[PDB]
Coordinates of C-alpha atoms and ligand atoms in Angstrom, one line a residue:
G11 CA -61.7 64.2 -14.3
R12 CA -61.4 62.6 -11.0
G13 CA -62.7 64.9 -8.1
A14 CA -66.1 67.4 -8.2
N15 CA -67.9 67.8 -11.3
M16 CA -68.1 71.5 -11.4
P17 CA -69.7 74.5 -14.1
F18 CA -66.6 76.0 -14.3
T19 CA -63.7 75.5 -16.1
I20 CA -60.1 75.9 -14.7
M21 CA -56.9 77.1 -16.6
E22 CA -53.6 77.5 -15.4
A23 CA -52.5 80.8 -16.6
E24 CA -48.9 79.1 -17.7
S25 CA -50.5 76.8 -20.2
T26 CA -48.7 75.9 -23.4
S27 CA -52.2 77.0 -24.7
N28 CA -51.8 80.3 -23.6
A29 CA -49.8 83.3 -25.1
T30 CA -48.0 85.5 -23.0
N31 CA -45.2 88.2 -23.2
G32 CA -44.9 88.2 -19.4
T33 CA -42.5 86.0 -17.2
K34 CA -43.5 82.5 -16.9
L35 CA -42.2 81.3 -13.6
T36 CA -40.0 77.8 -13.2
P37 CA -41.8 75.6 -10.7
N38 CA -40.7 74.8 -7.4
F39 CA -42.5 73.1 -3.9
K40 CA -41.5 76.0 -2.0
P41 CA -44.3 77.5 0.7
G42 CA -43.6 81.4 0.7
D43 CA -42.9 81.7 -3.2
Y44 CA -44.9 82.9 -5.8
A45 CA -44.3 79.8 -7.7
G46 CA -44.4 77.4 -5.3
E47 CA -47.9 78.8 -4.0
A48 CA -48.9 78.8 -7.1
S49 CA -51.7 76.2 -8.6
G50 CA -49.5 74.0 -10.9
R51 CA -46.7 75.1 -9.3
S52 CA -46.3 78.2 -11.5
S53 CA -48.1 81.6 -12.8
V54 CA -47.6 84.1 -15.1
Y55 CA -46.1 87.3 -13.8
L56 CA -47.2 90.7 -15.4
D57 CA -44.8 93.5 -14.7
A58 CA -45.3 95.9 -17.2
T59 CA -48.2 98.3 -19.1
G60 CA -49.3 96.1 -21.7
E61 CA -48.4 92.5 -20.4
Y62 CA -50.8 90.0 -20.6
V63 CA -51.7 86.5 -20.7
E64 CA -54.4 85.4 -23.5
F65 CA -56.6 82.3 -22.6
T66 CA -58.5 80.5 -25.1
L67 CA -62.3 79.8 -23.7
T68 CA -62.9 75.5 -23.9
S69 CA -66.7 76.4 -23.1
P70 CA -69.2 79.4 -23.2
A71 CA -68.3 81.9 -20.3
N72 CA -69.6 85.0 -18.8
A73 CA -68.0 84.8 -15.3
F74 CA -64.3 84.8 -14.0
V75 CA -62.1 84.4 -11.2
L76 CA -58.8 85.5 -11.5
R77 CA -56.3 83.7 -8.7
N78 CA -53.3 86.4 -8.5
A79 CA -51.2 87.3 -6.0
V80 CA -50.4 91.6 -5.5
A81 CA -48.2 93.2 -3.2
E82 CA -48.9 93.0 0.4
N83 CA -51.3 95.7 1.4
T84 CA -52.7 97.1 -2.0
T85 CA -55.9 97.4 -3.7
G86 CA -56.2 97.6 -7.5
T87 CA -57.2 96.3 -10.9
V88 CA -56.4 94.3 -13.7
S89 CA -57.6 94.5 -17.1
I90 CA -59.8 92.1 -18.9
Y91 CA -60.4 91.7 -22.7
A92 CA -62.6 89.5 -25.0
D93 CA -61.3 89.2 -28.3
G94 CA -59.3 92.1 -28.2
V95 CA -61.7 94.2 -26.7
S96 CA -61.2 95.6 -23.1
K97 CA -64.5 94.4 -21.5
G98 CA -63.9 95.3 -17.7
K99 CA -61.5 95.3 -14.4
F100 CA -61.1 92.9 -11.5
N101 CA -61.0 93.9 -8.5
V102 CA -57.8 92.8 -6.8
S103 CA -56.6 92.7 -3.5
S104 CA -53.9 91.6 -1.0
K105 CA -56.7 92.3 1.5
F106 CA -56.9 88.3 2.4
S107 CA -53.7 86.9 1.3
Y108 CA -50.1 87.3 3.0
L109 CA -49.8 85.6 6.4
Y110 CA -46.6 85.5 8.6
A111 CA -44.5 83.0 10.2
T112 CA -40.8 81.8 9.9
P113 CA -39.5 78.6 8.3
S114 CA -39.0 76.9 11.9
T115 CA -42.7 78.4 12.9
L116 CA -44.8 76.7 10.1
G117 CA -47.1 75.9 12.9
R118 CA -48.2 79.5 12.7
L119 CA -49.0 79.8 9.4
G120 CA -52.6 81.2 9.0
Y121 CA -52.7 82.8 12.5
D122 CA -50.7 85.7 12.2
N123 CA -51.4 88.8 9.8
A124 CA -49.4 91.3 10.3
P125 CA -45.9 91.8 8.5
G126 CA -42.8 91.9 11.0
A127 CA -38.8 92.1 11.4
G128 CA -37.7 88.4 10.5
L129 CA -40.8 87.3 9.2
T130 CA -42.0 85.7 5.9
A131 CA -44.8 86.0 4.0
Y132 CA -46.8 83.4 2.9
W133 CA -50.1 81.9 2.0
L134 CA -49.9 85.0 -1.3
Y135 CA -52.5 84.2 -4.1
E136 CA -56.3 85.4 -3.5
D137 CA -58.8 85.6 -6.1
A138 CA -60.9 88.0 -7.9
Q139 CA -64.7 87.6 -9.1
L140 CA -66.2 89.5 -12.4
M141 CA -69.0 88.6 -14.4
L142 CA -69.6 90.4 -17.5
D143 CA -72.7 91.4 -19.6
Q144 CA -72.3 88.6 -21.9
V145 CA -71.8 85.0 -22.9
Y146 CA -68.6 84.3 -24.9
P147 CA -68.0 81.0 -26.8
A148 CA -65.7 78.6 -27.2
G149 CA -62.4 79.9 -28.6
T150 CA -62.6 83.6 -27.4
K151 CA -59.6 84.9 -26.9
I152 CA -59.8 86.1 -23.4
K153 CA -56.8 88.8 -22.2
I154 CA -55.9 89.3 -18.6
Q155 CA -53.4 92.5 -19.3
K156 CA -51.8 95.0 -17.0
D157 CA -53.0 98.5 -18.4
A158 CA -52.2 101.9 -17.3
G159 CA -54.0 102.5 -14.0
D160 CA -53.8 98.6 -13.5
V161 CA -51.7 97.5 -10.3
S162 CA -48.2 97.7 -10.5
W163 CA -47.5 94.0 -10.8
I164 CA -49.4 90.9 -10.3
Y165 CA -48.8 87.3 -10.6
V166 CA -51.9 85.5 -12.8
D167 CA -51.7 82.0 -11.4
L168 CA -55.1 80.2 -12.9
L169 CA -58.6 81.1 -14.5
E170 CA -61.8 80.2 -13.6
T171 CA -64.3 80.3 -16.7
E172 CA -68.3 79.9 -16.2
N173 CA -71.5 80.1 -17.7
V174 CA -74.0 81.4 -15.0
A175 CA -77.5 81.3 -15.9
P176 CA -79.8 84.1 -14.9
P177 CA -80.7 84.5 -11.4
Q178 CA -83.7 82.2 -9.8
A179 CA -86.8 84.4 -8.5
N180 CA -88.5 83.4 -5.5
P181 CA -89.9 80.2 -5.9
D182 CA -93.2 80.9 -4.5
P183 CA -93.8 84.1 -2.2
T184 CA -97.0 82.7 -0.4
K185 CA -94.2 80.0 0.5
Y186 CA -90.6 82.0 1.0
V187 CA -90.8 85.0 3.0
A188 CA -88.2 87.2 0.6
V189 CA -85.4 89.0 2.5
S190 CA -85.7 92.8 1.0
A191 CA -84.2 96.0 1.1
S192 CA -86.3 96.6 4.2
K193 CA -86.6 93.0 5.9
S194 CA -83.3 91.1 7.0
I195 CA -82.8 87.9 7.1
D196 CA -83.4 87.3 10.7
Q197 CA -86.7 89.4 10.3
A198 CA -87.8 87.1 7.4
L199 CA -87.2 83.9 9.7
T200 CA -89.2 85.2 12.6
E201 CA -92.2 85.7 9.9
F202 CA -91.2 82.2 8.5
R203 CA -91.5 80.7 11.8
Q204 CA -94.5 82.6 13.2
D205 CA -96.3 81.3 9.5
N206 CA -96.6 77.7 9.2
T207 CA -97.7 78.1 5.5
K208 CA -94.2 79.1 4.8
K209 CA -91.6 77.0 4.4
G210 CA -88.5 79.1 4.4
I211 CA -87.1 82.6 3.0
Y212 CA -85.8 83.7 -0.1
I213 CA -82.6 85.9 -0.3
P214 CA -82.8 87.9 -3.7
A215 CA -79.5 88.6 -5.7
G216 CA -77.9 91.5 -4.3
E217 CA -75.2 91.8 -1.3
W218 CA -77.2 91.1 1.9
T219 CA -75.2 92.0 5.7
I220 CA -74.9 88.9 8.0
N221 CA -73.3 90.5 11.3
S222 CA -74.6 88.1 13.5
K223 CA -75.0 84.2 14.1
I224 CA -78.4 83.7 12.3
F225 CA -80.0 80.8 14.6
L226 CA -82.1 78.4 12.8
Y227 CA -84.7 77.3 15.1
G228 CA -88.6 76.3 15.5
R229 CA -88.3 73.6 12.8
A230 CA -87.1 72.7 9.6
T231 CA -86.2 76.0 7.4
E232 CA -85.4 76.1 3.8
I233 CA -83.0 78.9 2.9
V234 CA -82.9 79.7 -0.5
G235 CA -80.7 82.1 -3.0
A236 CA -80.9 83.6 -6.7
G237 CA -77.6 81.1 -7.0
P238 CA -74.1 81.9 -6.1
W239 CA -73.0 84.5 -8.0
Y240 CA -76.1 86.5 -7.8
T241 CA -77.0 86.4 -3.4
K242 CA -74.0 87.5 -2.1
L243 CA -74.1 87.4 2.3
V244 CA -71.4 89.6 3.2
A245 CA -69.8 90.1 6.7
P246 CA -69.2 93.7 7.2
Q247 CA -65.9 94.2 5.2
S248 CA -64.6 96.9 7.4
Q249 CA -64.7 94.4 10.1
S250 CA -62.7 91.7 10.5
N251 CA -62.7 88.1 12.2
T252 CA -66.4 88.4 12.9
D253 CA -68.3 85.2 13.8
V254 CA -71.5 85.5 11.2
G255 CA -73.5 82.7 9.9
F256 CA -76.2 80.6 10.8
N257 CA -76.2 78.5 13.7
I258 CA -78.9 75.4 13.7
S259 CA -81.0 74.5 16.4
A260 CA -81.6 71.0 17.1
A261 CA -85.4 71.8 16.4
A262 CA -84.3 73.3 12.7
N263 CA -82.6 69.6 12.2
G264 CA -84.3 68.7 8.6
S265 CA -83.1 72.3 7.3
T266 CA -81.7 73.2 3.9
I267 CA -79.7 75.9 2.9
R268 CA -79.0 76.4 -1.1
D269 CA -78.0 78.7 -4.3
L270 CA -75.9 81.6 -2.3
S271 CA -72.5 82.4 -1.7
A272 CA -71.5 83.7 2.0
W273 CA -68.1 86.2 1.9
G274 CA -66.5 86.5 5.5
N275 CA -64.2 88.9 6.7
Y276 CA -62.2 86.7 8.3
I277 CA -58.1 87.6 7.7
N278 CA -56.4 85.3 9.8
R279 CA -57.3 82.1 11.7
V280 CA -59.3 82.0 15.0
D281 CA -59.9 78.9 17.1
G282 CA -63.3 78.5 18.2
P283 CA -65.6 81.2 16.6
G284 CA -65.5 81.4 12.4
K285 CA -67.4 78.1 11.1
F286 CA -70.0 79.7 8.6
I287 CA -72.7 77.1 9.9
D288 CA -72.6 76.2 13.3
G289 CA -74.8 72.8 14.0
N290 CA -74.1 71.4 16.9
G291 CA -75.1 67.9 16.5
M292 CA -77.3 68.5 13.4
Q293 CA -79.1 65.6 11.3
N294 CA -80.6 65.9 8.4
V295 CA -79.4 69.0 6.7
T296 CA -78.8 69.8 3.4
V297 CA -75.9 72.5 2.8
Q298 CA -76.3 72.5 -1.5
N299 CA -74.7 74.9 -3.9
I300 CA -73.0 77.1 -1.8
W301 CA -70.0 79.2 -2.4
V302 CA -68.2 80.4 0.5
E303 CA -64.6 82.4 1.3
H304 CA -62.8 84.0 4.2
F305 CA -64.1 81.6 7.2
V306 CA -62.4 79.7 9.6
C307 CA -64.2 76.8 8.6
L308 CA -67.6 76.1 6.3
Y309 CA -68.3 73.7 9.0
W310 CA -67.0 71.5 11.5
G311 CA -69.5 68.8 12.7
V312 CA -69.7 67.1 16.2
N313 CA -72.0 64.1 16.1
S314 CA -73.7 65.4 13.5
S315 CA -75.3 62.9 11.2
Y316 CA -77.2 61.9 7.9
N317 CA -76.5 65.5 6.9
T318 CA -75.8 66.2 3.0
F319 CA -72.9 68.9 1.7
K320 CA -73.3 68.5 -2.2
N321 CA -72.2 70.9 -5.0
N322 CA -70.5 73.6 -2.8
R323 CA -67.4 75.2 -3.4
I324 CA -65.1 76.1 -0.6
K325 CA -62.3 78.7 -1.1
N326 CA -59.5 80.8 0.7
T327 CA -60.4 79.6 4.3
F328 CA -58.2 80.0 7.7
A329 CA -58.9 76.3 8.7
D330 CA -60.5 73.2 7.6
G331 CA -63.0 73.0 4.8
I332 CA -65.3 70.4 6.2
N333 CA -64.6 68.5 9.3
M334 CA -67.1 66.0 10.7
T335 CA -65.9 64.6 14.4
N336 CA -66.7 62.8 17.5
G337 CA -69.6 60.5 16.1
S338 CA -70.4 61.9 13.0
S339 CA -71.9 59.5 10.8
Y340 CA -73.9 58.5 7.5
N341 CA -72.9 61.8 5.9
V342 CA -73.2 62.9 2.5
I343 CA -70.0 65.1 1.3
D344 CA -70.4 64.6 -2.1
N345 CA -69.4 66.6 -5.1
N346 CA -67.8 69.8 -3.3
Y347 CA -64.6 71.7 -4.6
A348 CA -61.8 73.2 -2.2
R349 CA -59.0 75.8 -3.3
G350 CA -57.1 77.5 -0.9
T351 CA -58.3 76.2 2.9
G352 CA -56.3 76.8 5.8
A353 CA -55.8 73.4 7.2
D354 CA -57.1 69.7 6.2
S355 CA -59.7 70.9 3.3
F356 CA -62.1 67.6 3.8
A357 CA -61.8 65.6 7.2
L358 CA -63.2 62.8 9.7
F359 CA -61.9 62.9 12.8
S360 CA -63.5 59.9 14.8
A361 CA -63.5 60.2 18.7
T362 CA -66.0 60.1 21.5
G363 CA -70.7 56.7 19.9
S364 CA -67.4 54.8 19.6
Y365 CA -66.3 56.0 15.7
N366 CA -67.8 58.1 13.1
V367 CA -68.9 55.6 10.5
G368 CA -71.0 55.1 7.5
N369 CA -69.8 58.4 5.6
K370 CA -69.0 58.9 2.0
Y371 CA -66.7 62.0 0.8
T372 CA -67.4 61.2 -2.5
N373 CA -66.6 63.5 -6.4
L374 CA -64.6 65.6 -3.9
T375 CA -61.5 68.0 -5.4
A376 CA -59.4 69.8 -2.8
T377 CA -56.5 72.0 -4.6
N378 CA -54.2 74.6 -3.2
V379 CA -54.3 73.2 0.4
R380 CA -52.3 75.9 2.4
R381 CA -51.6 74.0 5.5
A382 CA -52.0 70.3 6.5
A383 CA -53.7 67.7 3.8
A384 CA -55.7 67.7 0.6
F385 CA -58.1 65.0 2.5
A386 CA -57.6 63.4 6.1
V387 CA -59.2 60.5 8.1
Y388 CA -58.5 60.0 11.5
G389 CA -59.6 56.9 12.8
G390 CA -63.3 55.6 12.0
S391 CA -64.7 52.5 10.5
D392 CA -66.6 51.8 7.4
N393 CA -65.7 55.3 5.4
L394 CA -65.6 55.9 1.8
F395 CA -63.5 58.0 0.4
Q396 CA -64.1 57.8 -3.4
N397 CA -63.6 59.6 -6.9
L398 CA -60.8 62.5 -5.4
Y399 CA -59.0 65.0 -6.8
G400 CA -56.3 66.7 -4.5
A401 CA -53.2 68.8 -5.6
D402 CA -50.4 71.3 -4.8
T403 CA -50.6 71.1 -1.1
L404 CA -47.7 73.8 0.7
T405 CA -46.5 71.3 3.6
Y406 CA -48.5 68.2 4.4
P407 CA -49.6 64.8 2.1
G408 CA -52.7 64.7 -0.6
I409 CA -54.2 62.0 1.6
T410 CA -53.4 61.5 5.6
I411 CA -54.0 58.3 7.2
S412 CA -54.2 58.5 10.9
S413 CA -54.5 56.4 14.2
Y414 CA -53.2 59.4 16.4
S415 CA -55.1 60.8 19.1
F416 CA -54.2 64.3 19.2
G417 CA -54.9 63.5 22.9
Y418 CA -58.6 63.3 22.4
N419 CA -60.4 60.1 23.3
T420 CA -60.7 57.9 20.4
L421 CA -59.7 54.2 19.4
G422 CA -59.0 54.5 16.0
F423 CA -59.8 52.5 13.2
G424 CA -62.2 49.9 13.5
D425 CA -63.0 46.3 12.2
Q426 CA -64.8 47.7 8.6
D427 CA -62.6 48.9 6.2
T428 CA -61.7 52.9 5.7
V429 CA -61.6 52.6 1.5
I430 CA -59.8 55.4 -0.3
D431 CA -61.4 54.6 -4.2
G432 CA -60.3 56.6 -6.9
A433 CA -57.9 59.7 -6.3
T434 CA -55.4 61.7 -8.5
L435 CA -52.8 63.3 -6.4
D436 CA -50.7 66.2 -8.1
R437 CA -48.0 67.6 -6.6
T438 CA -48.9 66.5 -2.9
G439 CA -46.7 66.3 -0.1
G440 CA -44.2 68.8 1.9
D441 CA -42.4 69.8 5.0
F442 CA -43.4 70.0 8.5
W443 CA -42.4 69.4 12.0
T444 CA -38.9 68.9 12.6
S445 CA -36.2 66.0 11.9
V446 CA -33.5 66.4 14.5
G447 CA -31.6 63.2 14.5
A448 CA -33.7 61.9 11.5
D449 CA -32.9 59.3 9.1
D450 CA -32.9 59.8 5.6
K451 CA -32.6 63.3 6.3
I452 CA -32.5 65.9 3.4
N453 CA -33.8 69.2 5.3
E454 CA -34.8 70.4 8.9
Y455 CA -38.3 69.0 8.4
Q456 CA -40.2 65.8 8.6
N457 CA -40.9 65.2 5.0
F458 CA -44.4 64.1 3.5
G459 CA -45.5 61.6 0.8
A460 CA -48.7 61.7 -1.4
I461 CA -50.3 59.2 1.1
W462 CA -49.4 59.3 4.6
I463 CA -50.2 56.3 6.6
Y464 CA -49.3 56.8 10.1
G465 CA -50.1 54.0 13.1
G466 CA -50.1 56.9 15.8
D467 CA -51.2 55.6 19.4
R468 CA -54.3 53.6 18.2
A469 CA -55.3 51.1 16.4
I470 CA -54.2 51.6 12.7
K471 CA -56.3 48.7 10.8
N472 CA -58.5 47.9 8.0
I473 CA -57.3 50.4 5.2
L474 CA -58.0 49.9 1.7
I475 CA -56.4 52.0 -0.9
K476 CA -57.1 51.5 -4.6
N477 CA -56.8 53.0 -7.8
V478 CA -55.0 55.7 -7.1
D479 CA -52.4 58.0 -9.6
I480 CA -50.0 59.8 -8.1
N481 CA -48.3 62.2 -10.3
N482 CA -44.7 64.1 -9.5
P483 CA -45.3 64.0 -5.4
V484 CA -42.9 66.4 -4.0
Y485 CA -41.0 63.2 -2.0
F486 CA -42.6 59.7 -2.1
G487 CA -45.9 58.3 -3.3
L488 CA -46.7 56.4 -0.3
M489 CA -45.1 57.2 3.3
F490 CA -45.8 54.4 6.2
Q491 CA -44.8 55.1 9.6
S492 CA -45.2 54.0 13.1
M493 CA -45.3 56.4 16.2
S494 CA -43.1 55.0 19.4
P495 CA -42.8 53.7 21.7
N496 CA -46.8 52.4 21.0
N497 CA -45.9 50.8 17.5
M498 CA -49.2 49.6 17.0
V499 CA -49.4 46.9 14.6
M500 CA -50.9 47.5 11.3
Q501 CA -53.4 44.8 10.0
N502 CA -55.2 44.4 6.8
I503 CA -53.1 47.6 4.9
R504 CA -54.0 46.9 1.6
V505 CA -52.5 48.9 -1.7
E506 CA -54.3 48.0 -5.0
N507 CA -53.6 49.5 -8.9
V508 CA -51.6 52.3 -7.8
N509 CA -49.3 54.3 -10.2
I510 CA -46.5 56.4 -8.6
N511 CA -44.7 58.7 -11.1
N512 CA -41.9 60.4 -10.7
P513 CA -41.5 60.8 -6.9
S514 CA -38.3 62.9 -6.5
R515 CA -37.1 60.6 -4.0
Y516 CA -38.9 57.4 -3.4
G517 CA -42.3 55.4 -4.6
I518 CA -42.4 53.7 -1.4
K519 CA -40.8 55.2 1.8
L520 CA -41.0 52.9 5.2
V521 CA -39.9 55.6 7.7
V522 CA -37.1 54.1 9.9
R523 CA -36.1 57.5 12.1
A524 CA -38.6 60.1 11.9
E525 CA -36.8 61.9 14.6
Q526 CA -34.8 61.2 17.7
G527 CA -36.5 58.5 19.6
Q528 CA -38.8 57.1 16.7
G529 CA -38.4 53.8 15.1
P530 CA -39.7 51.6 12.1
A531 CA -42.8 50.6 11.4
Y532 CA -44.5 47.8 12.6
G533 CA -47.1 45.2 11.1
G534 CA -47.2 45.2 7.2
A535 CA -49.2 46.3 4.0
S536 CA -50.1 44.3 1.0
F537 CA -49.5 45.9 -3.0
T538 CA -51.1 44.8 -5.8
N539 CA -50.7 45.9 -9.1
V540 CA -48.5 49.0 -7.3
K541 CA -46.4 50.4 -10.4
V542 CA -43.1 53.2 -9.7
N543 CA -41.8 55.1 -12.3
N544 CA -38.8 57.3 -12.6
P545 CA -37.9 57.4 -8.9
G546 CA -35.3 60.2 -8.3
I547 CA -33.9 57.5 -5.9
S548 CA -34.9 54.3 -5.4
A549 CA -38.6 52.8 -5.9
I550 CA -38.7 51.7 -2.3
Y551 CA -37.1 52.9 0.8
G552 CA -36.6 51.2 4.3
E553 CA -37.6 47.9 3.6
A554 CA -34.6 46.0 4.9
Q555 CA -34.1 48.7 8.0
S556 CA -37.9 47.6 8.9
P557 CA -37.8 44.2 10.4
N558 CA -41.2 44.6 12.3
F559 CA -42.6 45.5 8.9
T560 CA -43.3 43.2 6.0
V561 CA -44.0 44.3 2.7
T562 CA -46.3 41.7 1.0
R563 CA -45.8 41.9 -3.2
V564 CA -49.2 39.9 -4.2
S565 CA -48.4 40.6 -7.9
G566 CA -48.1 43.3 -10.6
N567 CA -45.5 45.0 -8.6
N568 CA -42.7 46.5 -10.9
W569 CA -40.4 47.0 -7.5
Ligands
LIG18 O1 -50.5 71.1 9.8 C1 -51.1 69.9 10.7 C2 -52.0 70.3 11.9 O2 -51.2 71.3 12.9 C3 -52.1 72.0 14.1 O3 -53.1 71.4 15.1 C4 -51.9 71.0 16.0 C5 -51.9 69.3 15.9 O4 -51.0 68.6 14.9 C6 -51.1 69.3 17.5 O5 -49.6 69.0 17.3 C7 -48.9 68.1 17.5 C8 -49.4 66.7 16.7 O6 -50.0 67.2 15.7 C9 -48.5 65.8 17.1 O7 -47.4 65.7 16.1 C10 -46.6 65.0 16.0 C11 -45.2 66.2 16.3 O8 -44.7 66.1 17.7 C12 -44.0 65.2 15.3 O9 -42.6 65.1 16.4 O10 -44.0 64.3 14.5 C13 -45.1 63.4 14.3 C14 -45.2 63.1 13.2 O11 -44.1 62.3 12.8 C15 -46.5 64.1 14.7 O12 -47.9 63.3 14.9 O13 -48.1 65.5 18.6 C16 -47.7 66.8 19.3 C17 -47.3 66.3 20.5 O14 -48.2 65.0 20.8 C18 -48.5 67.8 19.0 O15 -48.2 68.7 19.7 O16 -51.7 70.1 18.6 C19 -51.1 71.4 18.4 C20 -51.3 71.9 19.5 O17 -50.6 71.6 20.6 C21 -51.7 71.6 17.1 O18 -51.2 73.0 16.9 C22 -53.1 72.6 13.3 O19 -53.9 73.2 14.2 C23 -54.0 71.8 12.5 O20 -55.2 72.4 12.0 C24 -53.2 70.8 11.3 O21 -53.9 69.7 11.1
LIG19 O1 -63.8 76.3 22.1 C1 -64.9 75.7 21.2 C2 -65.3 74.4 21.6 O2 -64.3 73.6 21.9 C3 -63.8 72.3 22.2 O3 -64.0 72.1 21.0 C4 -63.5 71.4 19.8 C5 -63.8 72.2 18.3 O4 -64.4 73.6 18.3 C6 -62.6 71.7 17.3 O5 -61.8 73.0 17.6 C7 -61.0 73.1 16.5 C8 -59.6 73.2 17.4 O6 -58.9 72.1 18.0 C9 -58.9 73.5 16.1 O7 -58.4 72.4 15.9 O8 -58.8 74.3 15.3 C10 -60.2 74.0 14.8 C11 -60.5 75.6 13.4 O9 -60.2 76.5 14.4 C12 -61.4 74.3 16.0 O10 -62.6 73.9 15.0 O11 -62.2 70.5 17.5 C13 -61.6 69.8 18.6 C14 -61.2 68.5 18.4 O12 -62.5 67.8 18.4 C15 -62.7 70.5 19.6 O13 -62.0 70.0 20.9 C16 -65.3 71.9 23.2 O14 -65.2 70.5 23.4 C17 -66.3 72.5 23.1 O15 -67.3 72.4 23.9 C18 -66.5 74.1 22.6 O16 -67.3 75.1 22.4
CA20 CA1 -50.8 78.4 -12.2

């Protein structure tokens, strides 16, 4: 296991270890398709009473997350069985899935929630969470089965299984003011602020409304739940796109929020509001073991430094999972799991405080990225991305490495290495933008490899990509491209110990002409022990057509 170490186990419904009398979808890479949008690009379709998928626990479990697709505008159930005995019902719904666009307007992915004439549905999968009153042992047969009264049809994509500890009590009621049936989050924080013996607030097991942005000020604040399966912060679900969560004022730098879940009411992307945590320039804040869904982002840092995001679960958001921008340095984004983000799952955007520096994105998992990349780094200096797992990108690379400025004021990459070290990227890449007049055309889109190295309008230099396994990328393993006419010379771009397995087109693509008016790459890159295995067409494309780009084959290359 590369990536996050999480207490839950993921099993694909379509796994060959699972008996089923339903319909296993043949894989594809199509957005807007129940196979293309599934984890592992396949799911099991249950379509008649009595159809099931039978999972086998490989670890003890009392709790489950079922990723699934149901019809638009429906809510209902699907049944769970343990060793042949019915044990309850998942609450399944398309309330948060189904976002509408057209193949030529994928720029709108995530923004537009209503069906319409000529619109195609995307973002088809969503999740149902269920805890059972018993810990079932490894080897237990857990059956997801469509019974009478359950939904008319359901695509079963994957199952999380987890052995959840009992909820933790208030660590000390004389130091943590408890949220109660009669005392709100806001009221407990007021009592906390006015009593200097309090370290913070404790939010018990339950469902607690967050209908506002809850401001943390006065001093560093501890916000402690009972555990993410127990303490549920819930945005009013009869409202939609309510900007709720926490806002950490500078006075509350050094705060900690942990051991709770937060359930937003966003049903489409909104730019501006919608981050669960607002923390304008916050420092030394710790966000740990929380589980957030249906917000625009978990957090969007702006000159936020020395913070720690650890052990979190970020699922089904409408834009980025975590992004750190405009000077955000020396942060610890460690051991977080992301599935179903609406833009770059984990991103670092360096702008203006010359650069984002000294950040460490470690032990990160980012799957089912419904737009943009699993991991993305835009400029910066001395930033480490280490032990990553990315898989199943709908429209973009597993890893984007870009010195494009997006019109903002940035210097690009700095004089110290941006390092990608230890990464597994399964079925990443996709289609986006347009390729009018493009060389190497296969469709109406630009086509993206597992890792995109993009020289934009700013310096593209000091990039180290090592110890990377790239499995069945949609199109390419590595994709190098320079934006014209800037033609920034790539320097100190090095690739070491990389395996690219069964790319449909090429192991490595030097983009010659992305679209009309665009040219080949400038500079070069070195390759050491880079193996390309079974490319659909050839190992490398574009070398003879890129006369300003020098491929250096140091050693160990089978191409
Ligand atoms: O899913 C990607 C991205 O989309 C949204 O953010 C948009 C943001 O990217 C930008 O749009 C583009 C730039 O990305 C850039 O794209 C050019 C493109 O025009 C194309 O010809 O080819 C190259 C690649 O070979 C692209 O880099 O530049 C153009 C024009 O300069 C921009 O329009 O700005 C738009 C709004 O103007 C954003 O919508 C999305 O929000 C974001 O989350 C996502 O990562
Ligand atoms: O309107 C809110 C702020 O706008 C400016 O800040 C931008 C950030 O909020 C952020 O916005 C992202 C947006 O560009 C797009 O990519 O969608 C993301 C997801 O919803 C947004 O978070 O990032 C931008 C790029 O760094 C910022 O320009 C103003 O500078 C700020 O004062 C406003 O409060
Ligand atoms: Ca699956």
